[PDB]
Protein backbone atom coordinates (compact mmCIF):
# COMPACT_ATOMS: atom_id res chain seq x y z
CA UNK A 1 0.00 0.00 0.00
CA UNK A 2 0.92 3.75 -0.26
CA UNK A 3 2.52 5.53 2.73
CA UNK A 4 -0.75 7.57 3.05
CA UNK A 5 -2.82 4.31 3.13
CA UNK A 6 -0.47 2.59 5.70
CA UNK A 7 -0.63 5.70 7.97
CA UNK A 8 -4.45 5.91 7.70
CA UNK A 9 -4.77 2.28 9.06
CA UNK A 10 -2.15 3.02 11.75
CA UNK A 11 -4.30 6.06 12.80
CA UNK A 12 -7.51 3.96 13.02
CA UNK A 13 -5.72 1.39 15.32
CA UNK A 14 -4.12 4.12 17.49
CA UNK A 15 -7.40 6.11 17.95
CA UNK A 16 -9.32 3.05 19.25
CA UNK A 17 -6.66 2.59 22.00
CA UNK A 18 -6.13 6.37 22.57
CA UNK A 19 -9.92 6.78 23.23
CA UNK A 20 -10.28 3.71 25.49
CA UNK A 21 -6.92 3.15 27.26
CA UNK A 22 -5.89 -0.15 28.88
CA UNK A 23 -5.68 0.24 32.67
CA UNK A 24 -4.53 -1.96 35.61
CA UNK A 25 -3.22 -4.95 33.52
CA UNK A 26 -0.84 -6.50 36.12
CA UNK A 27 0.26 -6.21 39.77
CA UNK A 28 3.67 -5.68 41.41
CA UNK A 29 3.41 -9.15 43.14
CA UNK A 30 3.54 -10.77 39.61
CA UNK A 31 7.17 -9.70 39.13
CA UNK A 32 10.51 -10.61 40.68
CA UNK A 33 12.87 -7.63 41.17
CA UNK A 34 16.31 -8.26 39.58
CA UNK A 35 18.41 -5.06 39.19
CA UNK A 36 18.14 -1.31 38.57
CA UNK A 37 18.84 -0.49 34.88
CA UNK A 38 18.56 3.28 35.04
CA UNK A 39 17.52 6.26 37.15
CA UNK A 40 16.53 9.91 36.68
CA UNK A 41 14.16 12.61 37.97
CA UNK A 42 11.36 10.43 36.48
CA UNK A 43 12.17 7.60 38.95
CA UNK A 44 13.87 4.37 37.89
CA UNK A 45 13.81 1.43 35.46
CA UNK A 46 14.25 -2.03 36.98
CA UNK A 47 14.92 -5.35 35.29
CA UNK A 48 12.17 -7.72 36.50
CA UNK A 49 11.07 -11.28 35.72
CA UNK A 50 7.34 -12.00 35.18
CA UNK A 51 6.89 -15.32 37.11
CA UNK A 52 3.95 -16.68 35.12
CA UNK A 53 5.93 -16.58 31.82
CA UNK A 54 9.59 -16.38 32.88
CA UNK A 55 9.85 -13.32 30.57
CA UNK A 56 12.17 -10.45 31.52
CA UNK A 57 10.88 -6.85 31.29
CA UNK A 58 12.06 -3.30 32.02
CA UNK A 59 9.75 -1.87 34.75
CA UNK A 60 9.63 1.97 34.81
CA UNK A 61 8.65 3.03 38.37
CA UNK A 62 7.56 6.58 39.16
CA UNK A 63 6.85 7.89 42.66
CA UNK A 64 3.46 9.70 42.47
CA UNK A 65 4.43 12.33 45.09
CA UNK A 66 7.73 13.07 43.29
CA UNK A 67 5.90 13.36 39.89
CA UNK A 68 3.52 15.90 41.54
CA UNK A 69 6.44 17.98 42.97
CA UNK A 70 8.11 18.05 39.51
CA UNK A 71 4.82 19.23 37.90
CA UNK A 72 4.93 16.11 35.62
CA UNK A 73 1.35 14.84 36.24
CA UNK A 74 -0.01 15.66 32.75
CA UNK A 75 3.29 14.55 31.14
CA UNK A 76 3.15 11.16 32.95
CA UNK A 77 -0.47 10.61 31.97
CA UNK A 78 0.56 11.47 28.33
CA UNK A 79 3.43 8.96 28.48
CA UNK A 80 1.27 6.01 29.57
CA UNK A 81 -1.77 6.90 27.42
CA UNK A 82 0.44 7.25 24.28
CA UNK A 83 2.60 4.14 25.00
CA UNK A 84 -0.44 1.85 25.44
CA UNK A 85 -1.85 3.12 22.08
CA UNK A 86 1.12 3.01 19.68
CA UNK A 87 2.40 0.16 17.53
CA UNK A 88 5.53 0.54 15.43
CA UNK A 89 8.63 -1.69 14.94
CA UNK A 90 11.03 0.91 16.40
CA UNK A 91 8.91 1.82 19.44
CA UNK A 92 9.36 -0.02 22.79
CA UNK A 93 6.30 -2.11 23.63
CA UNK A 94 4.33 -1.25 26.82
CA UNK A 95 3.42 -4.77 28.05
CA UNK A 96 1.49 -3.87 31.25
CA UNK A 97 0.73 -0.86 33.44
CA UNK A 98 -0.68 -0.41 36.94
CA UNK A 99 -0.33 1.70 40.06
CA UNK A 100 -0.45 1.19 43.80
CA UNK A 101 -0.72 3.51 46.85
CA UNK A 102 2.69 5.10 46.14
CA UNK A 103 3.90 4.36 42.60
CA UNK A 104 3.04 4.21 38.90
CA UNK A 105 4.39 1.24 36.92
CA UNK A 106 4.99 0.81 33.17
CA UNK A 107 6.26 -2.65 32.28
CA UNK A 108 8.18 -2.40 29.02
CA UNK A 109 9.92 -4.79 26.62
CA UNK A 110 13.52 -5.39 27.92
CA UNK A 111 16.40 -4.69 25.50
CA UNK A 112 19.58 -6.30 27.01
CA UNK A 113 21.64 -4.65 24.21
CA UNK A 114 21.49 -1.45 26.28
CA UNK A 115 21.41 2.22 25.28
CA UNK A 116 22.87 3.59 22.03
CA UNK A 117 24.53 6.17 24.36
CA UNK A 118 26.80 3.56 26.02
CA UNK A 119 27.97 2.06 22.70
CA UNK A 120 28.42 5.50 21.05
CA UNK A 121 30.57 6.90 23.91
CA UNK A 122 32.67 3.68 24.16
CA UNK A 123 33.29 3.25 20.37
CA UNK A 124 33.69 7.06 20.08
CA UNK A 125 31.64 7.55 16.89
CA UNK A 126 29.69 5.66 14.21
CA UNK A 127 30.76 5.67 10.54
CA UNK A 128 28.24 7.35 8.17
CA UNK A 129 26.52 4.07 6.99
CA UNK A 130 26.16 2.98 10.69
CA UNK A 131 24.75 6.43 11.68
CA UNK A 132 22.47 6.36 8.56
CA UNK A 133 21.03 2.92 9.51
CA UNK A 134 19.92 4.31 12.91
CA UNK A 135 18.83 7.71 11.42
CA UNK A 136 16.52 5.91 8.89
CA UNK A 137 14.73 4.19 11.83
CA UNK A 138 14.20 7.57 13.56
CA UNK A 139 12.92 9.20 10.30
CA UNK A 140 10.33 6.38 9.94
CA UNK A 141 9.39 6.51 13.64
CA UNK A 142 8.82 10.30 13.50
CA UNK A 143 6.78 9.99 10.28
CA UNK A 144 4.59 7.42 12.19
CA UNK A 145 4.37 9.49 15.47
CA UNK A 146 3.78 12.86 13.73
CA UNK A 147 0.97 11.37 11.59
CA UNK A 148 -0.81 10.58 14.93
CA UNK A 149 -0.32 14.27 15.99
CA UNK A 150 2.31 13.14 18.51
CA UNK A 151 5.36 15.32 19.25
CA UNK A 152 8.28 13.33 20.79
CA UNK A 153 10.45 16.04 22.44
CA UNK A 154 13.32 14.06 23.95
CA UNK A 155 15.32 12.43 21.19
CA UNK A 156 18.84 11.52 22.33
CA UNK A 157 21.12 8.45 22.37
CA UNK A 158 20.27 7.91 26.08
CA UNK A 159 16.65 7.19 24.87
CA UNK A 160 17.43 4.68 22.12
CA UNK A 161 17.87 1.01 22.97
CA UNK A 162 19.61 -1.52 20.69
CA UNK A 163 17.64 -4.75 20.23
CA UNK A 164 18.95 -8.34 19.66
CA UNK A 165 18.88 -7.72 15.88
CA UNK A 166 20.82 -4.41 16.10
CA UNK A 167 17.72 -2.30 15.39
CA UNK A 168 16.75 0.58 17.67
CA UNK A 169 13.73 0.99 20.01
CA UNK A 170 12.61 4.46 21.13
CA UNK A 171 11.75 4.09 24.84
CA UNK A 172 11.19 7.31 26.80
CA UNK A 173 7.77 8.93 26.29
CA UNK A 174 8.00 11.23 29.36
CA UNK A 175 7.61 14.41 27.23
CA UNK A 176 5.57 13.02 24.30
CA UNK A 177 2.28 14.79 23.68
CA UNK A 178 -0.71 14.53 21.36
CA UNK A 179 -1.16 18.10 20.01
CA UNK A 180 -2.67 19.41 16.77
CA UNK A 181 -1.79 23.07 17.26
CA UNK A 182 1.34 24.66 18.63
CA UNK A 183 2.64 23.94 22.16
CA UNK A 184 4.73 25.92 24.65
CA UNK A 185 6.27 23.75 27.38
CA UNK A 186 9.98 24.27 28.02
CA UNK A 187 11.13 20.62 28.03
CA UNK A 188 13.78 18.39 26.47
CA UNK A 189 17.58 18.02 26.88
CA UNK A 190 19.88 21.10 26.50
CA UNK A 191 22.02 19.80 23.58
CA UNK A 192 18.87 18.78 21.61
CA UNK A 193 16.67 21.88 22.11
CA UNK A 194 15.53 23.64 18.91
CA UNK A 195 16.04 27.50 18.94
CA UNK A 196 12.26 28.11 19.07
CA UNK A 197 12.02 26.22 22.41
CA UNK A 198 14.96 28.20 23.96
CA UNK A 199 13.33 31.46 22.73
CA UNK A 200 9.94 30.60 24.44
CA UNK A 201 8.03 30.51 21.18
CA UNK A 202 5.01 28.38 20.36
CA UNK A 203 6.49 25.39 18.58
CA UNK A 204 5.42 22.29 16.67
CA UNK A 205 6.72 18.88 15.37
CA UNK A 206 9.64 20.67 13.60
CA UNK A 207 11.52 20.54 16.98
CA UNK A 208 11.79 16.73 16.55
CA UNK A 209 13.36 17.24 13.06
CA UNK A 210 15.92 19.70 14.54
CA UNK A 211 16.60 17.02 17.28
CA UNK A 212 17.16 14.45 14.49
CA UNK A 213 19.87 16.79 13.06
CA UNK A 214 21.55 16.91 16.52
CA UNK A 215 21.35 13.06 16.83
CA UNK A 216 22.82 12.43 13.32
CA UNK A 217 25.64 14.92 14.04
CA UNK A 218 26.37 13.29 17.44
CA UNK A 219 26.33 9.75 16.02
CA UNK A 220 28.68 10.66 13.14
CA UNK A 221 31.01 13.06 15.04
CA UNK A 222 31.07 11.37 18.46
CA UNK A 223 30.16 14.73 20.09
CA UNK A 224 27.09 17.00 19.68
CA UNK A 225 27.04 20.14 17.44
CA UNK A 226 26.47 22.42 20.47
CA UNK A 227 28.20 21.58 23.72
CA UNK A 228 29.65 23.46 26.72
CA UNK A 229 30.03 22.91 30.49
CA UNK A 230 26.72 24.66 31.32
CA UNK A 231 23.26 24.65 29.65
CA UNK A 232 23.21 28.48 29.24
CA UNK A 233 26.41 28.36 27.11
CA UNK A 234 24.80 25.52 25.01
CA UNK A 235 21.68 27.69 24.40
CA UNK A 236 23.86 30.66 23.27
CA UNK A 237 25.52 28.33 20.70
CA UNK A 238 22.16 26.94 19.47
CA UNK A 239 20.58 30.38 18.95
CA UNK A 240 23.78 31.86 17.31
CA UNK A 241 22.78 30.45 13.89
CA UNK A 242 26.33 28.91 13.52
CA UNK A 243 27.37 25.15 13.28
CA UNK A 244 30.87 23.61 12.54
CA UNK A 245 31.32 20.14 10.98
CA UNK A 246 34.24 17.67 11.43
CA UNK A 247 36.47 17.53 8.29
CA UNK A 248 35.59 13.79 7.89
CA UNK A 249 31.82 14.56 7.30
CA UNK A 250 30.77 13.82 3.68
CA UNK A 251 29.38 16.73 1.56
CA UNK A 252 25.92 15.00 1.55
CA UNK A 253 25.90 14.68 5.36
CA UNK A 254 26.81 18.37 5.88
CA UNK A 255 24.05 19.45 3.43
CA UNK A 256 21.43 17.28 5.20
CA UNK A 257 22.55 18.65 8.64
CA UNK A 258 22.41 22.30 7.42
CA UNK A 259 18.76 21.63 6.40
CA UNK A 260 17.84 19.94 9.74
CA UNK A 261 19.83 22.29 12.03
CA UNK A 262 18.04 25.17 10.30
CA UNK A 263 17.02 28.06 12.61
CA UNK A 264 14.52 29.28 9.92
CA UNK A 265 11.26 27.24 10.17
CA UNK A 266 10.27 28.06 6.55
CA UNK A 267 13.51 26.26 5.47
CA UNK A 268 13.85 23.40 8.03
CA UNK A 269 13.58 19.90 6.45
CA UNK A 270 10.65 17.95 7.86
CA UNK A 271 8.76 21.32 8.08
CA UNK A 272 8.18 22.14 4.36
CA UNK A 273 5.30 21.38 1.90
CA UNK A 274 6.99 18.02 0.96
CA UNK A 275 7.18 17.05 4.68
CA UNK A 276 9.33 14.00 5.56
CA UNK A 277 9.95 13.31 1.82
CA UNK A 278 12.55 16.14 1.76
CA UNK A 279 14.52 14.01 4.28
CA UNK A 280 13.84 10.55 2.75
CA UNK A 281 14.79 11.76 -0.77
CA UNK A 282 18.01 13.55 0.33
CA UNK A 283 21.32 12.45 -1.36
CA UNK A 284 22.61 11.19 2.05
CA UNK A 285 19.77 8.59 2.12
CA UNK A 286 20.12 7.53 -1.59
CA UNK A 287 21.29 4.00 -0.54
CA UNK A 288 18.47 3.67 2.04
CA UNK A 289 15.76 1.19 1.14
CA UNK A 290 12.98 2.61 3.39
CA UNK A 291 10.79 -0.49 3.00
CA UNK A 292 13.70 -2.91 3.80
CA UNK A 293 14.47 -0.84 6.98
CA UNK A 294 10.78 -0.91 8.09
CA UNK A 295 10.58 -4.70 7.34
CA UNK A 296 13.88 -5.14 9.27
CA UNK A 297 15.49 -6.89 6.21
CA UNK A 298 18.69 -4.78 6.33
CA UNK A 299 21.72 -6.41 8.01
CA UNK A 300 22.54 -4.32 11.12
CA UNK A 301 26.07 -2.75 11.35
CA UNK A 302 26.42 -3.85 15.00
CA UNK A 303 24.80 -6.67 17.07
CA UNK A 304 25.18 -6.26 20.90
CA UNK A 305 26.86 -9.24 22.64
CA UNK A 306 24.06 -11.62 23.80
CA UNK A 307 24.78 -13.03 27.27
CA UNK A 308 21.24 -14.12 28.21
CA UNK A 309 17.68 -12.69 28.34
CA UNK A 310 18.38 -11.23 31.80
CA UNK A 311 22.08 -10.24 31.45
CA UNK A 312 22.77 -6.57 32.42
CA UNK A 313 26.47 -6.21 31.33
CA UNK A 314 25.45 -3.62 28.67
CA UNK A 315 24.10 -1.36 31.51
CA UNK A 316 25.92 0.72 34.20
CA UNK A 317 25.39 -0.22 37.88
CA UNK A 318 23.13 1.94 40.07
CA UNK A 319 22.62 2.06 43.86
CA UNK A 320 19.73 -0.36 44.67
CA UNK A 321 16.86 1.24 46.59
CA UNK A 322 13.72 -0.27 48.18
CA UNK A 323 10.35 -0.10 46.35
CA UNK A 324 8.20 1.27 49.17
CA UNK A 325 4.38 1.02 49.06
CA UNK A 326 2.63 3.21 51.65
CA UNK A 327 -0.41 1.88 53.56
CA UNK A 328 -2.23 5.08 52.40
CA UNK A 329 -3.13 6.03 48.81
CA UNK A 330 -1.21 9.05 47.57
CA UNK A 331 -2.38 11.44 44.83
CA UNK A 332 -5.45 9.30 43.97
CA UNK A 333 -7.31 12.03 42.05
CA UNK A 334 -4.25 13.26 40.12
CA UNK A 335 -3.53 9.79 38.64
CA UNK A 336 -7.12 8.47 38.49
CA UNK A 337 -6.87 7.72 34.72
CA UNK A 338 -3.49 5.91 34.95
Amino acid sequence: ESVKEFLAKAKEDFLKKWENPAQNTAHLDQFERIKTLGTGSYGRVMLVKHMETGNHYAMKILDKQKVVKLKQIEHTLNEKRILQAVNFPFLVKLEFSFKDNSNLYMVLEYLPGGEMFSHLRRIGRFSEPHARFYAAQIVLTFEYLHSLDLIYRDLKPENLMIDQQGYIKVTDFGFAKRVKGRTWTLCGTPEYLAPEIILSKGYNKAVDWWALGVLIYEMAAGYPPFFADQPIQIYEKIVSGKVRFPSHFSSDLKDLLRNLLQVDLTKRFGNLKNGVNDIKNHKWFATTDWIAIYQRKVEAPFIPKFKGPGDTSNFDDYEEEEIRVSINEKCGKEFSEF
Binding site: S41, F117, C187, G188, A228, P231
Partner: peptide, 20 residues
Protein backbone atom coordinates in the same frame (compact mmCIF):
# COMPACT_ATOMS: atom_id res chain seq x y z
CA UNK B 1 40.74 19.26 18.97
CA UNK B 2 36.92 19.35 19.25
CA UNK B 3 37.03 15.72 20.52
CA UNK B 4 39.57 16.67 23.30
CA UNK B 5 37.35 19.62 24.29
CA UNK B 6 34.26 17.38 24.46
CA UNK B 7 36.07 14.67 26.49
CA UNK B 8 37.37 17.23 29.01
CA UNK B 9 33.84 18.74 29.35
CA UNK B 10 31.38 18.01 32.18
CA UNK B 11 28.75 16.76 29.69
CA UNK B 12 30.04 13.39 28.38
CA UNK B 13 27.87 11.30 30.76
CA UNK B 14 24.09 10.70 30.53
CA UNK B 15 22.28 14.01 30.11
CA UNK B 16 19.21 14.87 32.16
CA UNK B 17 16.02 16.42 30.81
CA UNK B 18 15.51 20.05 31.94
CA UNK B 19 13.35 21.27 34.89
CA UNK B 20 11.81 24.74 35.60
Amino acid sequence: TTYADFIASGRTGRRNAIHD
